[PDB]
Ligand binder design. Structure first.
Ligand SMILES: OC[C@H]1CNC[C@@H](O)[C@@H]1O[C@@H]1O[C@H](CO)[C@@H](O[C@@H]2O[C@H](CO)[C@@H](O)[C@H](O)[C@H]2O)[C@H](O)[C@H]1O
Ligand SMILES: OC[C@H]1CNC[C@@H](O)[C@@H]1O[C@@H]1O[C@H](CO)[C@@H](O[C@@H]2O[C@H](CO)[C@@H](O)[C@H](O)[C@H]2O)[C@H](O)[C@H]1O
Ligand SMILES: OC[C@H]1CNC[C@@H](O)[C@@H]1O[C@@H]1O[C@H](CO)[C@@H](O)[C@H](O)[C@H]1O
Ligand SMILES: [Ca+2]
Ligand SMILES: [Ca+2]
Ligand code: NA
Length: 700
């Protein structure tokens, strides 16, 4: 019974004996501690994880009719990761100037070139929503999740503005597109300058100004997480939840999530196409997409009565959530905010996001990266011939190049799951005819047919040493439609693609009626693996897709049949990978030499104290690479974080590195480290896949 399967995994996730949650009731990134991927330690948690927790409790609440666990999860979120306090967690937010939201600085192509000068070279444009939010809520305190929490206070900064909370607000990434997770420096969101460099805190690693930096706080959301929370509440409400107390909070979150629709420095959309941006007026700086983040910050202490906000200029397809956008914009969606323009902004976003998906879809069906309003992160002129979407430049790897941000196949499964939900929702709500449903449908239908060529149940694909799939004659499959991957029998196995290698560009967008099929946009799908999180996401994309086809036509379509059977089979084989704690498989991590490599940059002349009490950078360094344009040093991830050497898994990792990694070639000669991880989101993606198959397919 898929219902019983969901219930069993739900209990495994929630059990105090399994360790998914801390003693304060906050879900961790993962049960295991030694892991690094976006958070850099397993007992960090994320806005992402909280968003999945909500989703879990929504489907549990539908089955049990007990909504109290959803409400407790929301309460927990509000207590620990949304910095509003019913002691002020956003001091001086009231002094914000919406006619000068922030002070400009350039992004850089390497971490070595930071700190960046706070020059104000570009005057920031108008913030046109601050006034509405204030009138609507009586405050401009941001009701969004900060993205990262040190749940076990492992970095030892403490929580300045809420000291009795063990979980502390921290941040890592600050230094541009080449600062991988391995290359960042963990620092407190609320910086009283008690750590870092004396008199400066960590601020002077990131920005420079004429003066010593002031004590200050700042937060950054991840727009995909807050939207996924809204998506969860959308379904709560569809499934009968009707406590206005919480419905209203999801609407509030949605209203503030509008900050994600704005250019970083509120520059007019398109205005930097020729390298000469100018400040936005009204909504001129609104791109109506979910960019990578919004940040906010201000002074700490009595002498620092200032605050600021930035949007983001870079938008990734994998972050868009049109289910949230529909929920916040229609009577049928049910979560329209009360602000004057919140719902009508979200309505424009819903359409813009579907146009973005169609624009980005490769010749063979996969979704390419996204677009930016700030080329090179300093409003550089677009390259000659670069394709555009509403005057924003196509990017194959928005925001991060290490690794390229749209290579991970999870970035296909996560957004296409939402688009499949959305197809289902439109058709359920009686819409088969709008331009929006036609876009959603076209994109998900083309994607499903693409994806099925790389999904293997009870068979094992043939791949070569470099991770290319092979056909029956042994040739590499380099994208294209109709991929025919060679296969050997492998009862009980499943395989999914792992990455995409991207080349070319979509054609410039001129609307859905002039779309071209993007014949020069190529996805090469590669690296077969067994990621159970991606599996659970895929299953749902296939489930909702199939269900939609049957609501639309009366029967499962040809492709709907195939998507439904693939879902059923994937659920059936995955069940065998339950270890009693989660549905898991073993993974190799060839990236884990980056625990040891010297690549964490510090500027010359900069010494301070890290949270764990060590002097940083300290003496274990090499000179920075002068080709990267800095003047400083590199330490290692592990020297920066000496407490990682106390982790129970550390000596096995170090021993494996000593015996297998060859520093001169940069290769793992006797195999890479291997781990079996129990990730919270991944387990939720699996549990919800069982549930939704049961609800949409077994019951209807
Ligand atoms: O585990 C959750 C992360 C990975 N999946 C999607 C999101 O839920 C979340 O992403 C992270 O979200 C963080 C918050 O937006 C991103 O960090 C931000 O990256 C921004 C610039 O790249 C920085 O300006 C900002 O200070 C920093 O906080 C980070 O790159 C990005 O990977
Ligand atoms: O080391 C590469 C792969 C080895 N084979 C199995 C794969 O499962 C593994 O891929 C990694 O799989 C991880 C688990 O799905 C991926 O981690 C995820 O990366 C996501 C995107 O940054 C994050 O939002 C999320 O928090 C984080 O857990 C990570 O990117 C991805 O590279
Ligand atoms: O470039 C804008 C912000 C992005 N990253 C960190 C922030 O401190 C930057 O904001 C500026 O901080 C300044 C003082 O430190 C402040 O006086 C400006 O008003 C802020 O934009
Ligand atoms: Ca709070
Ligand atoms: Ca790098
Ligand atoms: Na407190």
């Amino acid at each position: 019974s898929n219902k019983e399967r969901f219930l069993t995994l739900y209990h495994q996730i929630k059990s105090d004996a399994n360790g998914y949650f801390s003693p304060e009731g906050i879900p961790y990134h993962s049960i295991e501690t030694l892991i690094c991927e976006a958070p850099d330690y397993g007992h960090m948690t994320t806005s992402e994880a909280y968003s999945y927790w909500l989703w879990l409790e929504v489907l549990y609440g539908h089955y049990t009719r007990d909504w109290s666990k959803l409400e407790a999860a929301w309460d927990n979120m509000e207590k620990y990761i949304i910095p509003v306090n019913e002691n002020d967690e956003q001091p001086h937010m009231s002094a914000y100037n919406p006619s000068s939201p922030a002070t400009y600085a350039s992004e850089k192509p390497y971490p070595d070139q930071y700190p960046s000068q706070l020059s104000g070279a570009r005057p920031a444009g108008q913030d046109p929503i601050d006034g509405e939010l204030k009138s609507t809520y009586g405050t401009n305190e941001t009701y969004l999740m900060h993205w990262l929490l040190d749940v076990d206070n492992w970095y030892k900064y403490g929580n300045l503005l809420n000291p009795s909370h063990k979980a502390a607000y921290v941040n890592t990434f600050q230094r541009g597109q080449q600062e991988s997770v391995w290359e960042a420096i963990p620092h407190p969101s609320q910086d009283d300058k008690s750590f870092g460099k004396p008199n400066e805190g960590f601020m002077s690693l990131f920005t420079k100004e004429n003066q010593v930096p002031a004590a200050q706080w700042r937060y950054t959301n991840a727009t995909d997480a807050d939207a996924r929370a809204i998506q969860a509440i959308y379904w709560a409400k569809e499934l009968g939840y009707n406590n206005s107390t919480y419905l209203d909070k999801a609407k509030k979150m949605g209203d503030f999530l509008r900050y994600g629709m704005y250019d970083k420095y509120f520059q007019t959309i398109g205005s930097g196409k020729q390298g000469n941006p100018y400040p936005g007026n009204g909504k001129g700086a609104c791109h109506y997409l979910m960019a990578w983040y919004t940040s906010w910050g201000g002074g700490l202490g009595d002498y620092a009565n200032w605050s600021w906000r930035i949007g983001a200029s870079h938008c990734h397809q994998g972050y868009q959530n049109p289910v949230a956008a529909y929920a916040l914009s229609s009577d049928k969606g049910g979560l329209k905010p009360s602000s004057a323009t919140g719902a009508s902004d979200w309505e424009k976003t819903l359409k813009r996001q579907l146009e973005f998906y169609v624009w980005l879809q490769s010749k063979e069906g996969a979704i390419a990266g996204g677009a930016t309003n700030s080329w090179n992160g300093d409003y550089s002129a677009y390259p000659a011939g670069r394709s555009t979407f509403y005057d924003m430049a196509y990017e194959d790897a928005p925001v991060y190049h290490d690794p390229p941000s749209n290579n991970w196949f999870g970035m296909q499964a996560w957004p296409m799951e939402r688009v499949a939900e959305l197809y289902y929702i439109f058709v359920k709500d009686g819409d088969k005819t709008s331009e929006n449903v036609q876009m959603a449908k076209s994109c998900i239908t083309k994607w499903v047919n693409y994806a099925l060529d790389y999904i293997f149940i009870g068979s094992r694909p043939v791949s070569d040493e470099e991770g290319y799939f092979l056909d029956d004659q042994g040739r590499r499959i380099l994208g294209g439609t109709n991929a025919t991957v060679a296969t050997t029998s492998a009862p009980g196995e499943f395989w999914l693609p792992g990455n995409i290698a991207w080349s070319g560009q979509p054609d410039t967008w001129n609307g859905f009626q002039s779309a071209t099929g993007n014949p020069n946009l190529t996805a090469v799908t590669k690296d077969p693996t067994q990621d159970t999180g991606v599996l659970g996401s895929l299953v749902k994309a296939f489930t909702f897709f199939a269900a939609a086809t049957k609501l639309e036509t009366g029967n499962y379509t040809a492709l709907g049949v195939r998507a439904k059977d693939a879902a059923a089979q994937l659920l059936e084989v995955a069940w065998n990978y339950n270890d009693g704690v989660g549905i898991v498989t073993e993974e190799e991590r060839e990236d884990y030499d980056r625990f040891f490599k010297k690549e964490v940059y510090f500027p010359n002349g900069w010494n301070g104290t890290f949270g764990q009490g060590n002097q940083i950078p300290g003496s274990s360094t090499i000179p920075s690479d002068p080709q990267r344009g800095g003047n400083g040093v590199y330490t290692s991830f592990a020297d920066l974080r000496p407490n990682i050497k106390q982790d129970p898994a550390w000596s096995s990792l170090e021993s494996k590195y000593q015996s297998s990694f060859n520093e001169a070639t940069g290769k793992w000669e006797n195999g890479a480290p291997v781990f079996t991880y129990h990730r919270f989101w991944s387990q939720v993606d699996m549990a919800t896949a069982y549930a939704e198959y049961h609800r949409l397919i077994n019951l209807e």
